[PDB]
Amino acid sequence: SRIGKQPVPVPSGVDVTINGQNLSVKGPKGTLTLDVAEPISVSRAEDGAIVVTRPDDERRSRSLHGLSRTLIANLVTGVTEGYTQKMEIFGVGYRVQLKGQNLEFALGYSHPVLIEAPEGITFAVESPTKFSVSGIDKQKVGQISAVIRRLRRPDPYKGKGVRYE
Amino acid sequence: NAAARANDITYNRLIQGLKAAGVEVDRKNLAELAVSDPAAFTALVDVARAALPEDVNAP
Amino acid sequence: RKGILGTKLGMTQVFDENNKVVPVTVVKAGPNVVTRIRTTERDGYSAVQLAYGEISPRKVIKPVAGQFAAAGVNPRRHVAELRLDDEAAVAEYEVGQELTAEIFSDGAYVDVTGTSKGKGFAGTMKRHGFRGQGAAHGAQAVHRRPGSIGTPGRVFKGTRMSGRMGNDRVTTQNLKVHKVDAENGVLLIKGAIPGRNGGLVVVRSAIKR
Amino acid sequence: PTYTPKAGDTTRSWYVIDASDVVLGRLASAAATLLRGKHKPTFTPNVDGGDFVIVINADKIAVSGDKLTKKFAYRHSGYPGGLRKRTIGELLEKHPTRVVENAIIGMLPHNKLGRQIQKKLKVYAGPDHPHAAQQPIPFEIKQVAQ
RNA sequence: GGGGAUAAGCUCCGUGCGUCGAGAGGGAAACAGCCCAGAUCGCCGGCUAAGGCCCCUAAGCGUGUGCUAAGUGGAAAAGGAUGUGCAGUCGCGAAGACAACACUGGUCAAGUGA
RNA sequence: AUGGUUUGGCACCUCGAUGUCGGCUCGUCGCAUCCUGGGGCUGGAGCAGGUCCCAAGGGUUGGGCUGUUCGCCCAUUAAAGCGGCACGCGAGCUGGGUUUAGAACGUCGUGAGACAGUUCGGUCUCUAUCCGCCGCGCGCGUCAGAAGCUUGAGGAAACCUGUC
RNA sequence: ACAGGAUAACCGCUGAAAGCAUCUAAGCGGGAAACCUCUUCCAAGACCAGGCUUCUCACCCUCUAGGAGGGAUAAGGCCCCC
Numbered sequence: 001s002r003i004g005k006q007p008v009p010v011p012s013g014v015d016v017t018i019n020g021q022n023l024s025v026k027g028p029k030g031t032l033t034l035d036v037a038e039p040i041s042v043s044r045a046e047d048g049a050i051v052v053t054r055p056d057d058e059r060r061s062r063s064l065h066g067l068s069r070t071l072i073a074n075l076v077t078g079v080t081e082g083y084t085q086k087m088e089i090f091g092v093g094y095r096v097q098l099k100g101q102n103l104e105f106a107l108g109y110s111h112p113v114l115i116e117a118p119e120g121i122t123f124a125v126e127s128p129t130k131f132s133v134s135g136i137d138k139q140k141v142g143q144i145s146a147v148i149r150r151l152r153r154p155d156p157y158k159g160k161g162v163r164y165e
Numbered sequence: 166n167a168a169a170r171a172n173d174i175t176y177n178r179l180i181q182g183l184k185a186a187g188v189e190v191d192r193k194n195l196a197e198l199a200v201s202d203p204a205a206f207t208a209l210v211d212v213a214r215a216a217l218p219e220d221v222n223a224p
Numbered sequence: 225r226k227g228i229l230g231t232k233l234g235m236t237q238v239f240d241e242n243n244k245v246v247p248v249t250v251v252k253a254g255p256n257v258v259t260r261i262r263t264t265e266r267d268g269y270s271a272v273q274l275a276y277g278e279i280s281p282r283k284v285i286k287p288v289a290g291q292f293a294a295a296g297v298n299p300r301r302h303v304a305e306l307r308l309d310d311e312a313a314v315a316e317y318e319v320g321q322e323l324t325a326e327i328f329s330d331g332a333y334v335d336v337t338g339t340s341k342g343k344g345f346a347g348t349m350k351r352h353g354f355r356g357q358g359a360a361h362g363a364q365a366v367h368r369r370p371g372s373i374g375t376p377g378r379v380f381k382g383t384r385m386s387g388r389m390g391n392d393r394v395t396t397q398n399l400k401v402h403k404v405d406a407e408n409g410v411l412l413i414k415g416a417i418p419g420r421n422g423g424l425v426v427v428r429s430a431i432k433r
Numbered sequence: 434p435t436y437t438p439k440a441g442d443t444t445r446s447w448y449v450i451d452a453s454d455v456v457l458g459r460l461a462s463a464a465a466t467l468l469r470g471k472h473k474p475t476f477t478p479n480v481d482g483g484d485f486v487i488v489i490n491a492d493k494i495a496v497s498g499d500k501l502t503k504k505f506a507y508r509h510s511g512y513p514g515g516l517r518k519r520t521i522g523e524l525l526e527k528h529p530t531r532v533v534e535n536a537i538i539g540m541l542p543h544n545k546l547g548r549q550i551q552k553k554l555k556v557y558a559g560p561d562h563p564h565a566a567q568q569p570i571p572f573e574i575k576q577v578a579q
Numbered sequence: 580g581g582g583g584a585u586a587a588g589c590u591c592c593g594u595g596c597g598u599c600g601a602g603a604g605g606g607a608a609a610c611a612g613c614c615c616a617g618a619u620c621g622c623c624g625g626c627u628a629a630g631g632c633c634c635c636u637a638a639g640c641g642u643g644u645g646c647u648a649a650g651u652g653g654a655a656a657a658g659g660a661u662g663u664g665c666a667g668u669c670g671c672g673a674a675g676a677c678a679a680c681a682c683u684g685g686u687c688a689a690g691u692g693a
Numbered sequence: 694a695u696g697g698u699u700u701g702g703c704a705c706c707u708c709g710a711u712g713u714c715g716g717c718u719c720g721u722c723g724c725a726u727c728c729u730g731g732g733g734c735u736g737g738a739g740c741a742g743g744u745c746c747c748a749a750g751g752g753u754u755g756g757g758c759u760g761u762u763c764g765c766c767c768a769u770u771a772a773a774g775c776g777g778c779a780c781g782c783g784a785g786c787u788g789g790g791u792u793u794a795g796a797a798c799g800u801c802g803u804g805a806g807a808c809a810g811u812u813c814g815g816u817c818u819c820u821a822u823c824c825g826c827c828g829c830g831c832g833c834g835u836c837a838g839a840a841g842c843u844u845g846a847g848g849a850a851a852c853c854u855g856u857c
Numbered sequence: 858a859c860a861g862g863a864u865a866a867c868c869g870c871u872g873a874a875a876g877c878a879u880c881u882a883a884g885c886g887g888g889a890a891a892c893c894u895c896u897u898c899c900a901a902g903a904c905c906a907g908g909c910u911u912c913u914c915a916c917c918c919u920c921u922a923g924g925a926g927g928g929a930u931a932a933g934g935c936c937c938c939c
Contacts, residue, residue, distance in 0.1 A: 002876060037883065059663090059882085063874045067883060070872065142870045143886060150868080150887090157738070166638080168474040175579040177638065191624055193435075199474045200436040221579070222642040260842080260910085267909055269844065286932065287840040290911045303842065345828080348719090357718055362787050364817095371718030372782040379826040380721070381512045382849075387828040395897065397858095431896075432858060434623065462634050469634085498650065510848055513721055523863085523893075528846090540634040547635095552905080579641055 004065035007049040008073045014080055018044055023072075027079030030120075030136045034075050037064045042072070074138050083138045085145045088130035091160035098125045107151055115148060168199030172210040178221065182213030225313075226327045227306040227428040228253050229276035230411065232338065234421055238402060238412065248402050248412040251336070253325040253427060255409065258317050259295045259303065269307065270314045274323065276424070277301025295319055302424055325409045328401055333430035334411075337395045338419035346389035354384075394418040398433050438475060443482045445553075447569035449562065450486065452533065453493035455574070461536035463574045464488065468550050469541060481550050487569055488537075488556040492529035496521060506535065529558035 010016055015026040023042060024033040036042050039061040043051045050072065054065040077083075089096060095106045103115040103123050117123055120140055125131035133148070135141040145164075152161035166176035174182075183190075188209070190198075198206045230253040238246050254276060262271035275292075279301040284292070292299040297320055308314045328334065348354040348370045357366045370386075373379050396417055403412040417425060448467055452460055470476050470483035496504075505518040524532055533556050541547050555564065562569075 001874065003873085059874080064883060065873085066876095067873045071883090074871080137871095139871045139885070144870095146869055147887085167472060167476050170472070170577055171474060173577055175577055175639070175641085177632085177641090178579050189625095193623060196435065203474075220642090262843085262909080267844080271843085273842070285840065285912080287911045287913095291841065292911095294911070305842065348827095355718070357786065361717095363717085364786060366718080366786045369718085369785070371785055372720070373785080373826080374720040374782055375778055377825080381826070383826050384719085385827045392898075397896080456640095458633075459640065462640075465634055471634090498648080500650080503650085508847090512849075515848080519893090527893095537634095542635060548904090555905090574640090576640060579639070 001054075001062050001066050004052050004054060004067075004069035006069070007045050007051050008069065008076060009049050010044070010076065011080060012048060014076070016044055016050065018042065018050075023050075025075060025079050027076075027136075029079055029082040032075050032079050032137060034071065036068055036072075040065060040068050042068070078136050078138050082134060082136045083141045084132060084134040085141050086130075086132045086165055087145065087148065087162060088165070089128075089162050091158070094160075095128045096125055096131050097128060098123045098131075103148070105151060113151065118144065168196075168203070168206055169210060172207055174210055174214065178217065179210060179213050181221075182215075182217040183209065186212050186216035188212070225306075225308065225429045225431070227274075227426060228323055228325070228327060229256050229274055229302065229304055230254060230425050230427055232417060232419055232421055232423050232425055233410075235416065240402075246402055246414050247416075248414050249417045251411045251413055251417065251425060251427065253328075253409055253411045256323040257297050257300065258319055258321045258323070259292065259297060261314060261317065261319060262305070263314070264311060270309070270311055271305045271307045272314055272317045273303060273305045275300035275303050304424075304426060306426075306428070324406075325404055325411060326406050328404050328411060328427070328429075330401065330404055332401045333433035334399050334401055334413065335395055335397055335428040335430050336399060336413065336417040337393060337426040337428070338417060338423055340390050340392050340394045340418050341420055343390035344388065345386070347386045348384065351386060351389045352384045398430050436475070438477060438480050438482060442475070443480065445484055447485045447487065447564065447567045448572035449564075449569040450488050450572050450574075451490050452488050453490040454495050456495050456497065457532070457536055459574060460488070460494070461533070461540050463572075464537050464554065465540040467572070468537070468553055479546075481546055481553075483550060483553060485553045485567075485569075486555070487562050487564055488533055488554075489562055490558075490560055491533045491556050492525060492558045494525075494533060501525075506532075530556045 013028065017024045017026075021036040021038065021041070022033065023036060025031065039056060040052065040054050043053065045051045052065065052069045052072065054061050056062075093108060097104065099114075101117050101123075103117065103125075105113045105115070107113060118140065120137055121133055121135040121144055123131065123133055133141060133144060135144075149162050149164075155161055169176050169179045190209075195206075195209075198209070230251040233250040233252050235247060235249045238248050240246055256274040256276050258272060259275045260273040262269055262273065264270055275297070277300050279299060281289070281299060284299045289299060343350070347368060349356060349368050354370055356368055357363050357371065359367055373383065373385075396415065399417070400414045401411055402414045405412065411427065413427075419425060450460060450464060464486050466472060467486050468483045470481065473482060475482060501522050502520050504521050506521070506524055507516065507518050509516050519527075521532060534554070537554055537556075538551060541550055555562065
């Protein structure tokens with residue numbers, strides 16, 4: 001509610017296209033498309049922003065209003081500069097490196113472990129122990145980051161595995 | 166009921182209007198009119214419409 | 225998935241290169257001629273129809289003779305359909321093309337489909353493997369009967385009771401082809417394939433292996 | 434005495450109903466009334482003097498609440514444990530027409546006359562029907578204000 | 580009201596209490612004992628009772644003002660529970676309130692707590 | 694608070710007949726899960742458990758004693774589940790127990806006799822009308838009469854597991 | 858069996874109401890011998906009685922010419938026979 005009432009600024013250099021509720025944005029980092037909920041309309045404010053206008057104050061709309069605002073903010077900040085997630089390992093003998101487009105780890109299992117890189121993300125490994133992933137959409141980056149985090153069961157005893165900064 | 170809804174009026178409102186208008190034809194002959202002579206039934210629907218109050222939901 | 229129509233000849237014995245014995249059933253995978261193409265745009269499903277067996281032209285009735293003439297091939301005794309998956313799979317068959325035994329290779333896994341032998345009216349002991357009752361210790365004329373049939377006082381559907389047995393289409397899966405004799409159009413299939421000698425069978429590439 | 438239809442009295446007309454974004458129960462009741470012949474002044478419970486009904490855009494139909502994933506369509510094969518259930522979601526995505534057919538069929542009488550009346554209902558998931566030759570009259574669900 | 584475990588479709592008494600028994604008809608899906616109502620016979624007439632008016636099924640997908648998100652409606656308790664509507668209080672607060680960054684100071688910006 | 698799986702209480706149902714326990718044969722259902730499957734915290738180091746949520750697809754042994762259910766025991770096993778259905782199933786079987794008439798012991802009675810005490814013996818009838826179910830035909834229908842090859846709405850079957 | 862889909866307990870991602878937080882009220886993912894497909898079989902009496910084809914694709918008589926009835930045939934089938 002409160003956050004939604006504040007229009008999110010739109011940088012000049014990034015193109016925003018509005019087709020009813022289908023909103024598409026072309027930024028320097030790439031392009032992303034968002035669909036807005038039907039009780040709320042979005043119009044690009046002429047001052048270099050977009051208007052998240054909620055016309056009703058019933059629970060559904062009042063809850064969706066701020067959510068729509070923050071989703072739009074995430075979309076614009078992800079199409080402008082993208083999103084980057086930093087990762088690392090703790091323990092010994094745990095090696096990580098990038099093999100082309102695909103990520104291979106040797107956590108200590110009897111078999112090599114490979115992770116497939118989906119679209120919109122790329123893997124950076126400047127050290128075997130620490131490495132990072134970056135993308136233009138925050139949701140996908142978070143999902144893949146959690147997936148790679150899952151490669152070891154939690155260790156409350158030694159803390160061997162992977163953890164965020 | 167079928168013939169009255171064909172004339173954009175419900176059966177109960179039609180019966181109330183017919184009662185208010187004072188016409189003393191019964192349901193047997195009302196059905197006979199509805200089947201045989203639609204013109205008479207339409208005229209009866211008009212007279213019942215005229216006999217109805219202006220706001221039927223008024224107290 | 226390849227396929228062919230054949231005939232069960234009998235079973236015999238062979239030895240592989242480790243001197244082990246292999247009981248092999250001999251199937252006459254005789255020459256089949258493709259008679260019709262089933263296409264999705266025409267029939268709604270993709271399938272290929274094969275004809276097998278040799279029959280005298282004076283034995284075929286007029287509708288069958290007309291169908292074979294429209295295909296463009298001489299009549300055969302038996303006709304069956306092979307159901308494929310998509311048009312890309314059925315594009316490799318065309319009417320009049322002849323399939324012989326060498327479409328299979330040694331060591332391949334095949335699916336033979338046939339009609340089981342007839343056993344006639346069979347009791348529950350034979351039809352369903354019911355354990356019998358006692359042959360002594362007082363049992364009175366119940367040595368082979370099913371026994372109980374078991375609130376609503378109703379015999380539920382599916383009751384495994386006595387009846388006719390056999391004569392049903394049966395598929396045996398993952399049979400290994402020990403040898404493909406190209407000269408006689410004979411497949412040597414390790415194992416036992418359904419039906420009596422001289423019956424019709426269908427040999428298809430295994431769906432599982 | 435009261436009028437009674439003869440051999441050649443009944444005349445049929447064809448209506449086509451667009452089920453896009455229409456409440457399932459509402460459309461089912463309207464179509465059931467049309468099939469039964471209740472809208473004709475010549476109506477008689479003995480005769481199926483109804484009209485043929487075509488329903489297009491069956492898959493676009495509207496279901497309120499969370500009935501799309503919580504309402505079950507049941508059927509028993511007769512064998513023990515032969516009970517099968519599908520929610521309206523999978524029923525719609527697999528056999529779109531079946532939901533509307535079941536709804537309409539449940540709302541008309543369960544006699545033999547109901548069985549004969551069922552013959553006069555055609556539903557289609559697509560936006561078009563093969564019955565253009567009959568020139569069906571588009572039908573809209575209105576309410577008679579009283 | 581007693582007996583029984585104030586349990587029983589248990590048992591035993593009182594009642595210018597009722598119904599059935601000996602009572603059809605309408606309603607409660609079906610349903611002696613509940614609700615409406617006491618059948619002299621006929622009518623292809625009318626008004627109503629209980630109960631009802633989306634379709635089955637006769638009559639309202641009636642009108643106006645609100646509530647419910649649980650298919651609650653369309654079974655049930657001790658107890659548990661930041662659901663929501665209304666109303667009443669109190670605490671703190673532009674001297675800048677709460678949050679955010681036990682109790683105190685700076686940014687911030689109206690409501691924030693029981 | 695649930696259930697009517699345990700003994701109950703009522704006597705509504707049957708005395709011009711509703712078979713009483715176990716066992717065999719054959720089932721079907723529930724999940725309040727014995728194994729197998731997915732989990733979580735561990736007072737979980739690993740192994741292995743403890744406890745708990747989901748989960749009913751399949752499986753869930755053979756013998757000794759007793760008429761037995763129950764139970765104890767012997768070997769195993771992945772495991773040797775708990776229950777409903779007239780404590781399923783005698784126009785399907787048994788008759789070992791209980792429940793007639795014979796006889797004996799203990800005890801009670803003067804006695805005839807008796808004992809929800811014991812012991813030995815002791816007729817289990819029927820040609821399936823209807824529903825139900827398993828199979829198999831005849832007739833008609835599917836808008837002329839036929840014949841090949843088929844799609845499949847919809848159902849049925851199967852689903853276990855160990856060691857190395 | 859393998860493989861796919863939707864899921865349970867559960868693990869999550871992206872975040873509101875409630876300026877933070879919150880696997881959640883919007884959404885998006887993973888997740889079991891259970892469920893839907895997948896394997897085998899029956900299946901158009903599936904009365905919505907289906908489909909692709911192929912064959913025969915014609916001859917009389919009667920009442921009264923409206924319809925019906927009867928006869929003889931084709932493709933084919935059955936009976937008799939082995």
